[PDB]
């Protein structure tokens, strides 16, 4: 599953989905995924 929501109008998403993902994890679509660069 994912770690947490990718939300579009938080410009520091990225940022929150690595916090997520402890330092690894990207955003794709609606969706922070850990393990990816």
Known sequence: ???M???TTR???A???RAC???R???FGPQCL????
Do not use: L, R, V, W
């Not at 850990?34 to 660069?37: A, E, K, L």
């Open 15 to 17: 940022q929150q989905c």
């Open 5 to 7: 929501p990718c939300f």
């Open 1 to 3: 599953s994912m770690c």
């Open 11 to 13: 410009p520091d998403m």
């Open 21 to 23: 993902c402890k330092g």
């Open 25 to 27: 994890g990207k955003c």
């Open 34 to 37: 850990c393990g990816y660069d």
